[PDB]
Amino acid sequence: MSVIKPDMKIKLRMEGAVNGHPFAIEGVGLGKPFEGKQSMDLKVKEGGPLPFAYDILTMAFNRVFAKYPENIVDYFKQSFPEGYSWERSMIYEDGGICNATNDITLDGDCYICEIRFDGVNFPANGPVMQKRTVKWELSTEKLYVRDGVLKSDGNYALSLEGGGHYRCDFKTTYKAKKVVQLPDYHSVDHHIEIISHDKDYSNVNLHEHAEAHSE
Structure with missing residues (x-):
């Protein structure tokens, strides 16, 4: 690609609510799309200190950052510069359910992500x-x-x-926002980790590494 470069930037904003209580978080990050790695610094802008586990938000904070081998069609890298969106449900075992959406576009060498996050029915005494x-x-x-x-x-x-x-x-x-080649059934293994954070998670550094497989 002349659109997907070895080093890319990220800018993101999440607006959402958990059990009715609203918040917003902004992020900036750096990633290596062909290596399947990214790192981002996230700041709570509204609704802090957050009254729930930050871990429920981290996988909402882009599969363009995944190492795809030559033999698996890469839906995500193909979709650029137009980009793609996603819609997601997350159903926890104690009945909490979160829905989220992300719309991902490209400006120069920076992905722009607009995320909506809505969680409900988390038990008051749950984790x-x-x-x-x-x-x-x-x-x-x-x-x-x-x-x-x-x-x-x-x-x-x-x-x-x-x-x-x-x-x-x-x-x-x-x-995808345009016609792309569709992949066969495959897997992506992911590791996500909060590398550092302040007392109430108003500031968080998050790392992710992802690799695709079909073997």
Whole structure:
């Protein structure tokens, strides 16, 4: 590509609410699309200090940053410069459900992301509202085509303070803004990690690494 470069920038804004309570976060970041790595600094702009586990937001904060091998069609890199959007549900085992959308465009060497996030029905004594989450385990996303667009599923898990896990099922639809070649069924393994943060998570540094496989 002369559109996808080895080093790219990111600018993002999330507006949302969790159990009815509104917030907004802005981010700037740097990524390496062919290496499948990115890093971003995130700042709470409205609705802080956030009254819920930051971990529920991190996978909403772009599969253009995934190392695709030569033998798997890369839906995401193909979609540029026009870009793509996604829509996602996240169904937690204790009944909390989050919906989110992202619209991703490209300006020069900077992806621009506009995210909406809405979470409801998190129990007041659950790990989200009590901030008892530690980190996401390594995740495997499974991607398949349906109705001319790309769909994906994952069975993800947060490790909890004091041990044990909290499970969440992610279901996503990715929609390219132009006709692109559609991929065969494949996987993406992801690792996401909050590298640093201040006391109430008003400032967070987040890293992600992703690699595709079909082997």
